[PDB]
Design an enzyme around this catalytic site. Sequence first.
Site, PDB file in Angstrom:
ATOM      1  N   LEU A  13       0.758  -1.271   0.228  1.00  0.00           N
ATOM      2  CA  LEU A  13       0.170   0.046   0.125  1.00  0.00           C
ATOM      3  C   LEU A  13       0.805   1.160  -0.051  1.00  0.00           C
ATOM      4  O   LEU A  13       0.519   2.171  -0.519  1.00  0.00           O
ATOM      5  CB  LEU A  13      -0.953   0.011   1.233  1.00  0.00           C
ATOM      6  CG  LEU A  13      -1.804  -1.029   1.387  1.00  0.00           C
ATOM      7  CD1 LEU A  13      -2.623  -1.261   2.531  1.00  0.00           C
ATOM      8  CD2 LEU A  13      -2.652  -1.138  -0.034  1.00  0.00           C
ATOM      9  N   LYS A  15       5.264   2.807   1.370  1.00  0.00           N
ATOM     10  CA  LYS A  15       6.545   2.380   1.911  1.00  0.00           C
ATOM     11  C   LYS A  15       7.234   3.767   2.029  1.00  0.00           C
ATOM     12  O   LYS A  15       7.211   4.707   1.339  1.00  0.00           O
ATOM     13  CB  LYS A  15       7.280   1.377   1.048  1.00  0.00           C
ATOM     14  CG  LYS A  15       7.486   2.069  -0.228  1.00  0.00           C
ATOM     15  CD  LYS A  15       8.068   1.080  -1.488  1.00  0.00           C
ATOM     16  CE  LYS A  15       8.274   1.736  -2.852  1.00  0.00           C
ATOM     17  NZ  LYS A  15       9.538   2.719  -2.693  1.00  0.00           N
ATOM     18  N   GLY A  16       8.266   3.743   2.913  1.00  0.00           N
ATOM     19  CA  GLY A  16       9.083   4.797   3.188  1.00  0.00           C
ATOM     20  C   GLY A  16      10.432   4.380   3.819  1.00  0.00           C
ATOM     21  O   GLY A  16      10.915   2.943   3.862  1.00  0.00           O
ATOM     22  N   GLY A  19       9.615   1.568   6.839  1.00  0.00           N
ATOM     23  CA  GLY A  19       8.973   0.453   6.774  1.00  0.00           C
ATOM     24  C   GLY A  19       7.940   0.327   5.597  1.00  0.00           C
ATOM     25  O   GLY A  19       8.104   1.453   4.783  1.00  0.00           O
ATOM     26  N   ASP A 134      -0.899  17.702  11.927  1.00  0.00           N
ATOM     27  CA  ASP A 134      -0.613  17.323  10.426  1.00  0.00           C
ATOM     28  C   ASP A 134      -1.799  17.270   9.940  1.00  0.00           C
ATOM     29  O   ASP A 134      -1.901  16.362   8.667  1.00  0.00           O
ATOM     30  CB  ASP A 134       0.158  15.975  10.541  1.00  0.00           C
ATOM     31  CG  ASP A 134       1.506  16.084  11.258  1.00  0.00           C
ATOM     32  OD1 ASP A 134       2.236  17.055  11.017  1.00  0.00           O
ATOM     33  OD2 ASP A 134       1.957  15.014  11.804  1.00  0.00           O
ATOM     34  N   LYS A 136      -4.143  17.864   6.850  1.00  0.00           N
ATOM     35  CA  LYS A 136      -3.990  18.147   5.542  1.00  0.00           C
ATOM     36  C   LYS A 136      -4.648  17.337   4.421  1.00  0.00           C
ATOM     37  O   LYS A 136      -4.647  15.901   5.231  1.00  0.00           O
ATOM     38  CB  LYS A 136      -2.489  18.250   5.174  1.00  0.00           C
ATOM     39  CG  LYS A 136      -1.559  16.964   5.345  1.00  0.00           C
ATOM     40  CD  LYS A 136      -0.118  17.399   5.021  1.00  0.00           C
ATOM     41  CE  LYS A 136       0.967  16.465   5.534  1.00  0.00           C
ATOM     42  NZ  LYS A 136       2.285  16.777   5.762  1.00  0.00           N
ATOM     43  N   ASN A 139      -3.682  13.436   4.589  1.00  0.00           N
ATOM     44  CA  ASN A 139      -3.941  12.917   5.706  1.00  0.00           C
ATOM     45  C   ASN A 139      -5.202  12.445   6.086  1.00  0.00           C
ATOM     46  O   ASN A 139      -5.443  11.694   7.278  1.00  0.00           O
ATOM     47  CB  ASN A 139      -3.158  13.710   7.047  1.00  0.00           C
ATOM     48  CG  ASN A 139      -1.698  13.605   7.242  1.00  0.00           C
ATOM     49  OD1 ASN A 139      -0.932  12.926   6.341  1.00  0.00           O
ATOM     50  ND2 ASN A 139      -1.256  14.299   8.307  1.00  0.00           N
TER      51      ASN A 139
HETATM   52  C1  FS7 Z   1      -1.888   4.066   7.990  1.00  0.00           C
HETATM   53  C2  FS7 Z   1      -2.561   3.098   6.984  1.00  0.00           C
HETATM   54  C3  FS7 Z   1      -3.823   3.087   7.299  1.00  0.00           C
HETATM   55  C4  FS7 Z   1      -4.879   2.211   6.178  1.00  0.00           C
HETATM   56  C5  FS7 Z   1      -4.344   2.585   4.623  1.00  0.00           C
HETATM   57  N1  FS7 Z   1      -5.196   2.223   3.690  1.00  0.00           N
HETATM   58  C6  FS7 Z   1      -4.766   2.367   2.270  1.00  0.00           C
HETATM   59  C7  FS7 Z   1      -5.692   2.102   1.109  1.00  0.00           C
HETATM   60  C8  FS7 Z   1      -5.228   2.308   0.167  1.00  0.00           C
HETATM   61  C9  FS7 Z   1      -4.065   2.645  -0.328  1.00  0.00           C
HETATM   62  C10 FS7 Z   1      -3.153   3.198   0.877  1.00  0.00           C
HETATM   63  C11 FS7 Z   1      -3.714   3.044   2.232  1.00  0.00           C
HETATM   64  C12 FS7 Z   1      -2.866   3.217   3.209  1.00  0.00           C
HETATM   65  C13 FS7 Z   1      -1.447   3.695   2.934  1.00  0.00           C
HETATM   66  O1  FS7 Z   1      -0.337   2.909   2.912  1.00  0.00           O
HETATM   67  O2  FS7 Z   1      -1.013   5.171   3.121  1.00  0.00           O
HETATM   68  C14 FS7 Z   1       0.042   5.660   2.741  1.00  0.00           C
HETATM   69  C15 FS7 Z   1       0.124   6.879   2.318  1.00  0.00           C
HETATM   70  C16 FS7 Z   1       1.291   5.172   3.668  1.00  0.00           C
HETATM   71  O3  FS7 Z   1       0.818   4.885   4.824  1.00  0.00           O
HETATM   72  N2  FS7 Z   1       2.355   5.511   3.168  1.00  0.00           N
HETATM   73  C17 FS7 Z   1       3.714   5.160   4.326  1.00  0.00           C
HETATM   74  C18 FS7 Z   1       3.320   4.289   5.350  1.00  0.00           C
HETATM   75  C19 FS7 Z   1       4.427   4.343   6.441  1.00  0.00           C
HETATM   76  C20 FS7 Z   1       5.774   4.791   6.084  1.00  0.00           C
HETATM   77  S1  FS7 Z   1       7.009   4.576   7.331  1.00  0.00           S
HETATM   78  N3  FS7 Z   1       7.096   5.691   8.397  1.00  0.00           N
HETATM   79  O4  FS7 Z   1       7.096   3.139   7.668  1.00  0.00           O
HETATM   80  O5  FS7 Z   1       8.436   4.614   6.376  1.00  0.00           O
HETATM   81  C21 FS7 Z   1       5.994   5.425   4.706  1.00  0.00           C
HETATM   82  C22 FS7 Z   1       4.879   5.604   4.048  1.00  0.00           C
HETATM   83  C23 FS7 Z   1      -3.155   3.105   4.406  1.00  0.00           C
HETATM   84  C24 FS7 Z   1      -2.234   3.423   5.678  1.00  0.00           C
END
Ligand code: FS7
Length: 288
Positions: A13, A15-16, A19, A134, A136, A139
């Site tokens: 979904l 990544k960064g 994780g 945050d 926006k 978010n």
């Molecule tokens: C939080 C969930 C909740 C449901 C969801 N539901 C989603 C449904 C569809 C598409 C994406 C979804 C996401 C999602 O992954 O959001 C993104 C913007 C995201 O979380 N990117 C992200 C997350 C963690 C890291 S890190 N700090 O580990 O490196 C970097 C980029 C999500 C996200």
Amino acid sequence: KIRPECFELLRVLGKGGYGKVFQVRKVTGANTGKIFAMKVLKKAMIVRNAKDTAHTKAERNILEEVKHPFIVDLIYAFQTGGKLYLILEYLSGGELFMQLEREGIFMEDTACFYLAEISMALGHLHQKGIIYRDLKPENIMLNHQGHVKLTDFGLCKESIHDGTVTHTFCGTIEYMAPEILMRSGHNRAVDWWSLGALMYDMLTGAPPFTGENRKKTIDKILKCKLNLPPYLTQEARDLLKKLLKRNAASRLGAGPGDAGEVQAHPFFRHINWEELLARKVEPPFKPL
Ligand SMILES: C[C@H]1CCc2nc3ccccc3c(C(=O)O[C@@H](C)C(=O)Nc3ccc(S(N)(=O)=O)cc3)c2C1
Ligand SMILES: [Zn+2]
């Protein structure tokens, strides 16, 4: 004992640097087949830094304590030797950002709906002493029915980082309150400023203080010289003036009443808060 093996991975979904988030379904037991988002953090990316570690813990503690329809739900949380796992509800309705892109400008009643639901989320957090900061469009996600869910209480989601010390400013800073960019100390009043910038964005097509580049934008936010376009309703104009005040203590919502002060504004005169919180109101946008 819940374990990673309890979930089958269906897609990536996001990544960064810390994780990844996977879409998953539960393989066995109760809710065999229920869909979740699984955030997987690499401890080694985190444990060396006292700030990121605290931030990580804060996320889980917040999401564990929060019980609210308009904030992303945390179902399970567990860890391995090298990874932290957060099983969250899966948000199929995508980003509110993706809604503002299509529409350009929200009709008043549509903006009013989303701003209303967000305000209840903010009220929930604030009475718990939690400050969002945050707020926006990226978010604010939507569930399958089309209601608001606040996300991003944890580590930085950006691919490009601002500076080498903090992650406070890595996103767009268009919706961030001036006192934060000033580093002059801040409280929950920043969320009501942010609500205003978001409201302005919904109803005009762009945040209130955007410039050619980032420095110009920051300068505009700090200068805080608000021009309200003539096509805004009397109610929206009046709420926007009272939300987008540079003096934090003068903002609507900055008072002891917090979210109740904002919800009492005429811009929300048509809102039934009991039925809104109970998700009885039909959303303007329906993903499925
Ligand atoms: C939080 C969930 C909740 C449901 C969801 N539901 C989603 C449904 C569809 C598409 C994406 C979804 C996401 C999602 O992954 O959001 C993104 C913007 C995201 O979380 N990117 C992200 C997350 C963690 C890291 S890190 N700090 O580990 O490196 C970097 C980029 C999500 C996200
Ligand atoms: Zn960052």
